[PDB]
Structures are given as C-alpha cells and as structure tokens.
Amino acid sequence: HHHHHENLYFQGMYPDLVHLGGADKYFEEILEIVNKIKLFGDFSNEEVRYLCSYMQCYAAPRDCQLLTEGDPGDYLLLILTGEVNVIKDIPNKGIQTIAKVGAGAIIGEMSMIDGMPRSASCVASLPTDFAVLSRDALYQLLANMPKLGNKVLIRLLQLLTARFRESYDRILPKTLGELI
C-alpha cells in the first residue's frame, strides 16, 4: 500500500524510471551494503530479507536526475548498480561535483532523516538500479522491529561519519582564509 502510493510518486515525478519490483531481487547486494556496519554486529540473512520487504527498486537511465538540490524529499536510495555524480550549486563557484559514488553507495539519507530540502543534486551518469527506503517505511520498521532498526540507524551513522571524514579531508585543504 505504502509502496503502491510510493510507486505513483516515482512514476509521476520520475518519468524515466522503470519499476523493478521488490528489493528481494537484490538481496545479495543489499546484504553486502548493510553488512559494511562495524562495531555493533552484523545483519542476519533473515534480518536482510525482512528489510528487503520494506523496499521497491527502480532502473534509471544515464542522465537521470535521481535527486535535485532544494527539492523536498523523505526517501533514501541504495545504489545497487551504476554511478552517480553528486553536485551542488556552490555560491561564488557555480555548479560543481562534490562527490562521485557507485554500486554500494547510499544517497538521499540526509533529507530522509531530517526533513530539510535535498542538500545536493544526484545524477545517474550510467544506467543505475536502486532500492528506495522512505521515512514512513523506516518509521514502521523502528516501531515493529526496533533492534533491527538500530542496526539500520548505526549503518546510516557510519555512512555519515565516513562521508564527513572523507569529504573534509578532500575539501578543507582547498579552502581560502578563515573558516569561521
């Protein structure tokens, strides 16, 4: 049902997307993504099959704008295949690529988590398949299976800390003058 209306949104908003059906078709890829979790213990096969039931998948073509800076968004994307350019309209610099990600990446977590507009645009540079997790689906997972929920949240925490460390190791040395 959630997925029914989620699908209407994607097909309505995202004309180029082809619906692939349930994320169980990408169990092995999703298992690998989530089991990058460290320090807190892995997801079981059974836990991953359950998580897969919360998600539907889509194929995007080359040059598909998966996410657009400044748009509202309540969903994140697990990149199963392909390549995505993360770009931002940076004051005093114009539109620039801040990151390039591929198979295994998670994108769109920020607005899904905090309800602010998208921080950057994400464009499929190659044909790209992905699973979608909405905030509503996450709500339901935390309500129903909170321990699994905390594995998911720890995975997203580690995604963000790694991204923050990598990004600012790359970006700070390119800065000019005083930062504060």
Ligand X SMILES: Nc1ncnc2c1ncn2[C@@H]1O[C@@H]2COP(=O)(O)O[C@H]2[C@H]1O
Binding region for ligand X (CB under 6 A) = 67, 73, 86, 98-99, 101, 107-111, 118-120, 122, 163, 167
Q: Is 167 annotated as a binding residue?
A: yes
Q: Measured from the CB of residue 45, what is the shortest distance to ligand X in angstroms?
A: 27
CB atoms within 10 A of CB 18: 13
Name the nearest CA neighbour of 107 among 116, 119, 94: 119
Residue 89 contacts residue 137 (beta carbons within 8 Å) = no
Near its own copies by CB under 8 A, which window of 14-22, 23-31, 49-57, 157-165?
A: 157-165
In angstroms, rounded to a whole number, what is the distance separating the alpha carbons of residues 123 and 83? 8
Write down the least CB distance from residue 104 to its own copies, Å.
17
Q: At closest approach, how far in Å is the CB of 84 from its own copies?
A: 12
Confirm or deny that 54 is annotated as ligand binding: no
155 in a labelled binding site: no
Q: Which long-range contacts (CB under 8 A, 24 or more apart) does 167-173 make?
A: 167/98, 167/99, 171/98
Q: Is position 125 an interface residue for its own copies (rule: CB under 8 A)? A: no
- The answer to whether residues 10 and 60 touch, using CB atoms and an 8 Å cutoff, is no
Binding-site positions for 3',5'-cyclic AMP: 108-111, 118-119, 167-168
